[PDB]
Amino acid sequence: SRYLTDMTLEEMSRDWSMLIPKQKVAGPLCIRMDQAIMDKNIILKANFSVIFDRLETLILLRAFTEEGAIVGEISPLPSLPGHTAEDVKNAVGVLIGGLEWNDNTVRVSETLQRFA
Amino acid sequence: SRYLTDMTLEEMSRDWSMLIPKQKVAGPLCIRMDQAIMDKNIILKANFSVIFDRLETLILLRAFTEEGAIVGEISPLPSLPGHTAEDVKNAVGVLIGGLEWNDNTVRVSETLQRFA
């Protein structure tokens, strides 16, 4: 019983577009990032469901340019196979990877690093 | 002039082609990899110049499918700025990253891991 956020409802409800789309499936999680993006300073805001006072399941992470532009996202698979912080942190390191590839400078919301 | 190798002259002298080309510049080093490649088992063979009995400079690393197919390569920049094992290991972790992205299963020549 709960849920936690870095992002605004807006930030999440919003829909977005990749010029150079890149999907992937990391076990129970779908990573996406626009490869067209370069030399920008990015951040990963994310929002986990919180159960009995602990970061449980990640609901949604997305990547933001300084300009509030969405450039990447990790969203649970529709079949919602139960996923672990591993599947996550893994998936994360990855998206970062893919992003860093374009000289992009990627930070992470305090929320996240916490985990674990 | 002394020097060490995993690859055959053939393997190195050879020229190759990327369906989905991906370049990058990692300080003094140019990484390349064909993003088109997927679900294959890859290995990184590399060849360092050896000075007074230590792995000094990397001359060339390339990535190989099981089928002896070249799919990625790290080659020093033409201007040959003196590079360090860092610039390297960095660059390496990267290429691996980029490769792993396509479900590719990437190994590394014993030579390499050695370093450092």
UniProtKB/TrEMBL annotation, chains A, B:
Its annotated function is as follows: Inhibits post-transcriptional processing of cellular pre-mRNA, by binding and inhibiting two cellular proteins that are required for the 3'-end processing of cellular pre-mRNAs: the 30 kDa cleavage and polyadenylation specificity factor/CPSF4 and the poly(A)-binding protein 2/PABPN1. In turn, unprocessed 3' end pre-mRNAs accumulate in the host nucleus and are no longer exported to the cytoplasm. Cellular protein synthesis is thereby shut off very early after virus infection.
Cellular location(s): Host nucleus; Host cytoplasm
The organism's superkingdom is given as Viruses
Keywords recorded for this protein, A-Z: Eukaryotic host gene expression shutoff by virus, Host cytoplasm, Host gene expression shutoff by virus, Host mRNA suppression by virus, Host nucleus, Host-virus interaction, Inhibition of host innate immune response by virus, Inhibition of host interferon signaling pathway by virus, Inhibition of host PKR by virus, Inhibition of host pre-mRNA processing by virus, Inhibition of host RIG-I by virus, Inhibition of host RLR pathway by virus, Interferon antiviral system evasion, RNA-binding, Viral immunoevasion
Similarity remark: Belongs to the influenza A viruses NS1 family.
Q: Cite the record's note on assembly.
A: Homodimer. Interacts with host TRIM25 (via coiled coil); this interaction specifically inhibits TRIM25 multimerization and TRIM25-mediated RIGI CARD ubiquitination. Interacts with human EIF2AK2/PKR, CPSF4, IVNS1ABP and PABPN1.
According to the UniProt entry, the note on domains is: The dsRNA-binding region is required for suppression of RNA silencing.
Residues of the whole record sequence present: 82 to 197 of 225
* Any one GO cellular component localisation term in the record: host cell nucleus
Name listed for the protein in its UniProt record: Non-structural protein 1
Which biological process terms from the Gene Ontology are attached to this UniProt entry?
symbiont-mediated suppression of host cytoplasmic pattern recognition receptor signaling pathway via inhibition of RIG-I activity; symbiont-mediated suppression of host gene expression; symbiont-mediated suppression of host mRNA processing; symbiont-mediated suppression of host PKR/eIFalpha signaling; symbiont-mediated suppression of host type I interferon-mediated signaling pathway
- Recorded GO MF terms: protein serine/threonine kinase inhibitor activity; RNA binding
